[PDB]
Structure 1
Amino acid sequence: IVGGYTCGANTVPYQVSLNSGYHFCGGSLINSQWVVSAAHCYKSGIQVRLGEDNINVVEGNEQFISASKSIVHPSYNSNTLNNDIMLIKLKSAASLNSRVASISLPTSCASAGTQCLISGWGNTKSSGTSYPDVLKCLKAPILSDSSCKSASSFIITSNMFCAGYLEGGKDSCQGDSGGPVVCSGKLQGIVSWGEGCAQKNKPGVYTKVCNYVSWIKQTIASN
């Protein structure tokens, strides 16, 4: 997260860290046994870390649970990142408490202007590299599709949406991928991609979760 702030220990209870020997992507807990993340975050041997704040210090509220199954969206396209979403089932149910809680799925799509909360342990620099140990937060508005399309060198589909700032300075970044974009208490987006980080005319692109609720529900009910 570039231009954000320190969230505060466990103030984003649904935020998870995907670990394969080190933190590499974020995710969101949608119920005691399932996590939602980005398909481009797929890797074998994923361990889901819940109740985390500082990912390098055992603070006492963590729960480390390995994945028993990973399901990348059937139509994921690695070249365009269209359908960049993935479901991860935990080997054992997470223990829900005040610091570990699930986030609700959308019943409708969000509209431009709506304020959302984006969080992650990704890079905090737009012109360099500096990874934080504690969770970072950023309030960002959903923007009109035109906002991202105007200067984009890549395809932006109906399964993606634009959020952030056009004058740069604030944006999600590498390491934040797979993380949540929560608006009005619902998980509306998944950190997916962008050209650089917090660059002028180049806001972040997020997977539009409201388009996948049917697939998510059917999949977890059958697995």
Structure 2
Amino acid sequence: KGGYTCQENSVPYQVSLNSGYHFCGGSLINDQWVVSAAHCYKSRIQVRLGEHNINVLEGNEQFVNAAKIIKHPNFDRKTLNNDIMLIKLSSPVKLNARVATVALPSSCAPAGTQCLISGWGNVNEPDLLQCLDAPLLPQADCEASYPGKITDNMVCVGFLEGGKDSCQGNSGGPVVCNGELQGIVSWGYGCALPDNPGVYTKVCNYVDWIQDTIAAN
């Protein structure tokens, strides 16, 4: 764990992917497109926006069905390399104070940059959006923690001493640094274990693929 409950609607680009229940997160990058992790693929997905407590109808939510789901063409289910996926919504959503988009990276954020990670974890009890402030770690530290498992399309975010980390339910969610989406919650060995910080898809390596895909679809 280690996170804290986010201030209500303070992360307006955060979405919940639901196929009967919440199973993954995602980010709204424009009024009709969401970015998430490829391992979050399901044939039928309902996107829920403007959420805080996913177990109660609060009044600010928008429920929209996914029209097209496009996984990165080179996604590897074993290594998790290229763990990224785009979802086009059935219809554009209404952008407001509680539902907004997040900017794609203008470049790759350097190690040491402080970021915000968010998501819901693992029927009437409150299930509130959680937040965690954590820095991007240097590649060498990431590699040392996961020998032979880190590719150039991944980045570690968190603490080598563990204690604070993203966990199950968080996959596909945003890692935002200086107002730009720099990572997507992907994997890790356990959660919050020392010497095994979370691994995230490095979004700056995919800006052109994202833009090219949205334009062609």
TM-score of Structure 1 vs Structure 2, range by shorter chain:
over 0.9
Residue 152 in structure 1 maps to residue 151 in structure 2: no
Deviations 1:74-112 (A, max 9, x none): 000001000000000000100000000000001100011
Aligned to 1:67, the other structure's residue is in SS state: strand
- The correspondence for 2:166, drawn from 167, 172, 177, is 172
Summarize the Cα distance change of 1:172–1:154 in structure 2 as closer, same or farther, 3 Å threshold.
farther
Aligned to 1:150, the other structure's residue is in SS state: helix
AA at the equivalent of 2:127:
D
Deviation of the 1:46 alpha carbon: 0.1
Taking structure 2 as the reference length, the TM-score comes to: 0.97
The residue aligned with 2:51 is 52
Summarize the Cα distance change of 1:201–1:11 in structure 2 as closer, same or farther, 3 Å threshold.
same
The residue aligned with 1:5 is 4
What percentage of residue pairs aligned between the two structures are identical? 72
Which sections of structure 2, spanning at least 5 residues, go unmatched? none
Contact 1:113 1:142 in 2 (8 A): yes
Give the aligned length: 215
1: CA distance between counterparts of 2:153 and 2:213?
19
Aligned to 1:119, the other structure's residue is in SS state: strand
The residue aligned with 2:84 is 85
The residue aligned with 2:202 is 208
Deviation of the 1:152 alpha carbon: 1.5
Deviations 1:31-51 (A, max 9, x none): 000000000000011000000
Deviation of the 1:151 alpha carbon: 3.0
The residue aligned with 1:94 is 93
The residue aligned with 2:32 is 33
Taking structure 1 as the reference length, the TM-score comes to: 0.94
Which sections of structure 1, spanning at least 5 residues, go unmatched? 124-130
Deviation of the 1:154 alpha carbon: 5.3
AA at the equivalent of 2:158:
G
Contact 2:13 2:100 in 1 (8 A): yes
User: What RMSD in Å do the two structures reach over aligned CA positions?
Assistant: 1.1
The residue aligned with 2:192 is 198
Deviation of the 1:155 alpha carbon: 1.2
Deviation of the 1:148 alpha carbon: 2.0
2: CA distance between counterparts of 1:153 and 1:142?
18
Deviation of the 1:116 alpha carbon: 0.3
Aligned to 2:204, the other structure's residue is in SS state: helix
Residue 138 in structure 1 maps to residue 132 in structure 2: yes
The residue aligned with 1:127 is none
The residue aligned with 2:156 is 162
Contact 2:55 2:126 in 1 (8 A): no
Contact 2:187 2:200 in 1 (8 A): yes
Residue 74 in structure 1 maps to residue 73 in structure 2: yes
Deviation of the 1:73 alpha carbon: 0.2
The residue aligned with 2:42 is 43
Residue 189 in structure 1 maps to residue 183 in structure 2: yes
AA at the equivalent of 1:63:
Q
Residue 112 in structure 1 maps to residue 111 in structure 2: yes
Residue 65 in structure 1 maps to residue 67 in structure 2: no
Contact 1:27 1:180 in 2 (8 A): yes
Aligned to 2:136, the other structure's residue is in SS state: strand
Residue 15 in structure 1 maps to residue 14 in structure 2: yes
Deviation of the 1:145 alpha carbon: 1.1
Contact 1:121 1:132 in 2 (8 A): no
